[PDB]
Design a protein around this ligand. Structure first.
Ligand SMILES: [Cl-]
Ligand SMILES: [Cl-]
Ligand code: NA
Ligand code: NI
Length: 129
């Protein structure tokens, strides 16, 4: 599923992401836009052999199991394929664990490079929320 911007905002809000660990909803929309282009099926292989999955590009080195990242962890205790679902529940639950991990949203390189220190509320303007 490729979400619309306000559609994803609404879904993220309902799942508890607005102000989660102090990150306003626009942060999470901005992250999803630049990580996955709002596409729940997005996958990208990393140089270390791990792969990023889903709308928030969650990495198999730590967070999910994809059966091909030797020595990795599975901290969200889920198959990486669960992160590709049209339903974002599994991505949001795992994102909450990631953002709690110590480095906040810096865990998402795209967020740090393209969202951090910008007018992120812009990502939720015009939305009925
Ligand atoms: Cl593995
Ligand atoms: Cl933080
Ligand atoms: Na893993
Ligand atoms: Ni990544």
């Amino acid at each position: 599923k490729v979400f619309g911007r306000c559609e994803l905002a609404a879904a993220m809000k309902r799942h508890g992401l607005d102000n989660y660990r102090g990150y306003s909803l626009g942060n999470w929309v901005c992250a999803a836009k630049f990580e996955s282009n709002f596409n729940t099926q997005a996958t990208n292989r990393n140089t270390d052999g791990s792969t990023d999955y889903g709308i928030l590009q969650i990495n198999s080195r730590w967070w999910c199991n994809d059966g091909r990242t030797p020595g990795s962890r599975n901290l969200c205790n889920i198959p990486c394929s669960a992160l590709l679902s049209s339903d974002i529940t599994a991505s949001v639950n795992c994102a909450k664990k990631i953002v709690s991990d110590g480095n906040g949203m810096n865990a998402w390189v795209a967020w740090r490079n393209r969202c951090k220190g910008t007018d992120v509320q812009a990502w939720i303007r015009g939305c009925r929320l």
